[PDB]
Design a protein around this nucleic acid. Structure first.
Ligand SMILES: [Mn+2]
Ligand SMILES: [Mn+2]
Ligand SMILES: [Mn+2]
Length: 301
DNA sequence: TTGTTCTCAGGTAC
DNA sequence: CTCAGCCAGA
DNA sequence: TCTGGCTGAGGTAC
DNA sequence: CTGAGAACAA
């Protein structure tokens, strides 16, 4: 029974809350006693270009494996005993998926007894229902009804870095604008996205951080922070703990520090725009229009 | 001239 | 993200 | 009859 | 997730 470091668990709870899954399934299975088999699985999903992160997870947790599904990969942990040991330690730090973890533990503990009685089995299946209801469930087919065809500041920053590495965004932008001396306005943004159903979580962010705002559009919400001074301070505290977006955070800090110098010279303004390009290059950028090359059309002004 | 607020939306990476 | 599923081994 | 390794995909929530 | 851009506020 491996005992995990708290700082590792704190960051991982954040990352799990963002991009991880705690899943309970009822597999139809003829060779099983009650014609169904229970499956409990912990997943962390991540783009394959970042599978080193998931490979590190296997080493750190000490069990489980990584699979590759084309463009995306997953760390997977299914083995019941290590799964129980792991989730028991992760769950005090989970914020969004804590109940799921607790229910999966409850299930694992009643497994022996749930395999000896149809009554017990069915009840355990309703707990699976509860986990699926807590999850962002979409394509669930087999339910328990189907079965009823039986006959401190640092701690906050570690967690937050995990959530940021998973569901957050560190954004640098060059926005075209005639009124600006160099016809462009630099823009820096820290963002955390979450479906509006869960904006209570983003509301907490505003409180614990002290600055920033929550915005809604369609059915998703963002926590955003754009003010240069608070952003510099915030990202200075955060970046030691980031693993996926640390380089972006440092580039944003380096940009902020050079804003004075950038706003006086045309060659330094361009140079800073190339730092913006670098951030976008590190991000999973898809719809970028204005690059530094665009700004290089300053060869008129 | 600049910083910032506020909302929307493309294309995946969950 | 969160399901769906098959197969080999004991 | 049970378990764990392994594969494929629908529909958003990033 | 990570862009876009119109408009308010200095
Ligand atoms: Mn998420
Ligand atoms: Mn992510
Ligand atoms: Mn995500």
């Amino acid at each position: 029974n491996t005992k995990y470091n708290k700082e590792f668990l704190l960051y991982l709870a954040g990352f799990v809350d963002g991009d991880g899954s705690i899943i309970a399934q009822i597999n139809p299975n003829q060779s099983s006693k009650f014609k169904h088999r229970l499956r409990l699985t912990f997943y962390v999903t991540q783009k394959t270009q970042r599978r080193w992160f998931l490979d590190k997870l296997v080493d750190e947790i000490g069990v489980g494996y990584v699979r590759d599904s084309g463009s995306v990969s997953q760390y997977v942990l299914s083995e019941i005993k290590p799964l129980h040991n792991f989730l028991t330690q992760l769950q005090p730090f989970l914020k969004l998926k804590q109940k799921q973890a607790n229910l999966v533990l409850k299930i694992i503990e009643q497994l022996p007894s749930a395999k000896e009685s149809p009554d017990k089995f069915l009840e355990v299946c309703t707990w699976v229902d509860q986990i699926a209801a807590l999850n962002d469930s979409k394509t669930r087919k087999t339910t328990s009804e189907t079965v009823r065809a039986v006959l401190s500041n640092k701690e906050f920053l570690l967690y937050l870095a995990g959530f940021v590495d998973s569901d957050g965004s560190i954004i640098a932008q060059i926005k075209p604008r005639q009124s600006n001396k160099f016809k462009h306005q630099l823009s820096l943004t820290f963002a955390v996205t979450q479906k509006t159903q869960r904006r209570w979580f983003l509301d907490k962010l505003v409180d614990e951080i002290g600055v920033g705002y929550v915005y809604d559009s369609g059915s998703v919400s963002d926590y955003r922070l754009s003010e240069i001074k608070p952003l510099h301070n915030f990202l200075t505290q955060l970046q030691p703990f980031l693993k996926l977006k640390q380089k972006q955070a440092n580039l944003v800090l380096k940009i902020i520090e050079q804003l004075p110098s950038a706003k006086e010279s045309p060659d330094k303004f361009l140079e800073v725009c190339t730092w913006v390009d670098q951030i976008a290059a590190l991000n999973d950028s898809k719809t970028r229009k204005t690059t530094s090359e665009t700004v290089r059309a300053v060869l008129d002004s």
